[PDB]
Design an enzyme around this catalytic site. Sequence first.
Site, PDB file in Angstrom:
ATOM      1  N   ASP A  35       0.840  -1.194   0.000  1.00 38.03           N
ATOM      2  CA  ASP A  35       0.000   0.000   0.000  1.00 38.03           C
ATOM      3  C   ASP A  35       0.879   1.249   0.000  1.00 38.03           C
ATOM      4  O   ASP A  35       1.396   1.645   1.046  1.00 38.03           O
ATOM      5  CB  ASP A  35      -0.934  -0.023   1.205  1.00 38.03           C
ATOM      6  N   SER A 199      -0.764  15.496 -12.315  1.00 37.46           N
ATOM      7  CA  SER A 199      -0.981  15.076 -13.687  1.00 37.46           C
ATOM      8  C   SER A 199      -1.251  16.298 -14.553  1.00 37.46           C
ATOM      9  O   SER A 199      -1.827  17.293 -14.099  1.00 37.46           O
ATOM     10  CB  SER A 199      -2.143  14.084 -13.764  1.00 37.46           C
TER      11      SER A 199
HETATM   12  N1  LIG Z   1      -4.287   3.369   0.472  1.00 39.70           N
HETATM   13  C1  LIG Z   1      -4.239   4.000   1.779  1.00 39.70           C
HETATM   14  C2  LIG Z   1      -5.086   5.271   1.773  1.00 39.70           C
HETATM   15  C3  LIG Z   1      -6.409   5.226   2.187  1.00 39.70           C
HETATM   16  C4  LIG Z   1      -7.173   6.382   2.174  1.00 39.70           C
HETATM   17  C5  LIG Z   1      -6.612   7.574   1.749  1.00 39.70           C
HETATM   18  C6  LIG Z   1      -7.445   8.848   1.736  1.00 39.70           C
HETATM   19  F1  LIG Z   1      -8.751   8.528   1.481  1.00 39.70           F
HETATM   20  F2  LIG Z   1      -7.335   9.461   2.954  1.00 39.70           F
HETATM   21  F3  LIG Z   1      -6.965   9.683   0.768  1.00 39.70           F
HETATM   22  C7  LIG Z   1      -5.292   7.618   1.333  1.00 39.70           C
HETATM   23  C8  LIG Z   1      -4.528   6.466   1.345  1.00 39.70           C
HETATM   24  N1  LIG Z   2      -6.480   1.679   1.138  1.00 44.63           N
HETATM   25  C1  LIG Z   2      -6.038   0.775   2.188  1.00 44.63           C
HETATM   26  C2  LIG Z   2      -6.997  -0.409   2.237  1.00 44.63           C
HETATM   27  C3  LIG Z   2      -6.663  -1.589   1.593  1.00 44.63           C
HETATM   28  C4  LIG Z   2      -7.537  -2.663   1.627  1.00 44.63           C
HETATM   29  C5  LIG Z   2      -8.742  -2.550   2.299  1.00 44.63           C
HETATM   30  C6  LIG Z   2      -9.697  -3.738   2.329  1.00 44.63           C
HETATM   31  F1  LIG Z   2     -10.207  -3.933   1.075  1.00 44.63           F
HETATM   32  F2  LIG Z   2      -9.008  -4.853   2.722  1.00 44.63           F
HETATM   33  F3  LIG Z   2     -10.716  -3.475   3.203  1.00 44.63           F
HETATM   34  C7  LIG Z   2      -9.080  -1.368   2.940  1.00 44.63           C
HETATM   35  C8  LIG Z   2      -8.206  -0.294   2.908  1.00 44.63           C
END
Ligand SMILES: NCc1ccc(C(F)(F)F)cc1
Ligand SMILES: NCc1ccc(C(F)(F)F)cc1
Length: 330
Positions: A35, A199
């Site tokens: 992530d 972008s």
């Molecule tokens: N993949 C992690 C993640 C989850 C949510 C956000 C948000 F919504 F806060 F932008 C950023 C990054």
């Molecule tokens: N963006 C972070 C994230 C990644 C996976 C999940 C899930 F799908 F496992 F719930 C939630 C939040």
Amino acid sequence: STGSATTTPIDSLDDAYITPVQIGTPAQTLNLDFDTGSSDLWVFSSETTASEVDGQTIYTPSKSTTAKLLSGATWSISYGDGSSSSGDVYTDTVSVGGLTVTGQAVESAKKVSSSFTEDSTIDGLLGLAFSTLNTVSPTQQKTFFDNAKASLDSPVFTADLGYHAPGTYNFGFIDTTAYTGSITYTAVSTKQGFWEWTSTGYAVGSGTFKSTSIDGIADTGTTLLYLPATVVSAYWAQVSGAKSSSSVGGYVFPCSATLPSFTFGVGSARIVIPGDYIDFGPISTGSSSCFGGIQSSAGIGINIFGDVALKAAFVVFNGATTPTLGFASK
Ligand SMILES: NCc1ccc(C(F)(F)F)cc1
Ligand SMILES: NCc1ccc(C(F)(F)F)cc1
């Protein structure tokens, strides 16, 4: 040193990708969601409430001879989709595709939200944003990438996500056989802790390219592409019968329609997302309404280049002292 690991979609829609990670001595292999939008390495463990575990592989620190409890440390995280988890913190040896880091913070989940419990194929997350976002208290902890940086041949990692197919995360080197043409690099802002970039515009199908700055984050942990309402409206206007559904929570379209491609700008280069990548299938089993992979960021507050966009490209995360993002066609 370098590392290389295969990443695999968890289902037929590419909803997420999992990558095997070895934790502890002897190795305990868990499948983690890499992530770039977060900065915590957390895992289902033997300390997780038993009712909140449904098929996941759990990390058992008591079986690892290198695990040490990080006295007094806790963590608590909440994700932009409402998911959350929390627990205590160990340090242990962590290896990804042959690349080993000793003394990595491994955050052991005592409680997880329902959305994780229902996702039996994801054993945890491996955060790859900047360490300023790590939630460990009272002592903030570094990410796997930050800990590995010193020993890497080059302070980079690359994401090569596949469309309905396995892909590759590489650490420490750029596979010049994995892309075509040149890599276009663009500046990153680290002020919010994200891999944030701008972008240079977009085009729908074979339409004219619209030069306009879209600030957003490169997030391997988010499935879809979230863009400003003006852009998203112009895309779905080209799909006959598409409409925004409040009950469903986004744009849906007739499953019989063919979707136009979507182009986004990286400096002077163009990355083309095939229309098939934007089809996320029926909203319910047997429905003739399908869910769109391009949705509005209005409710979220930030634009997110998630997997839908990133899997159309070879993406370099350059963690030099002045960080940059590289994009290439593939
Ligand atoms: N993949 C992690 C993640 C989850 C949510 C956000 C948000 F919504 F806060 F932008 C950023 C990054
Ligand atoms: N963006 C972070 C994230 C990644 C996976 C999940 C899930 F799908 F496992 F719930 C939630 C939040």
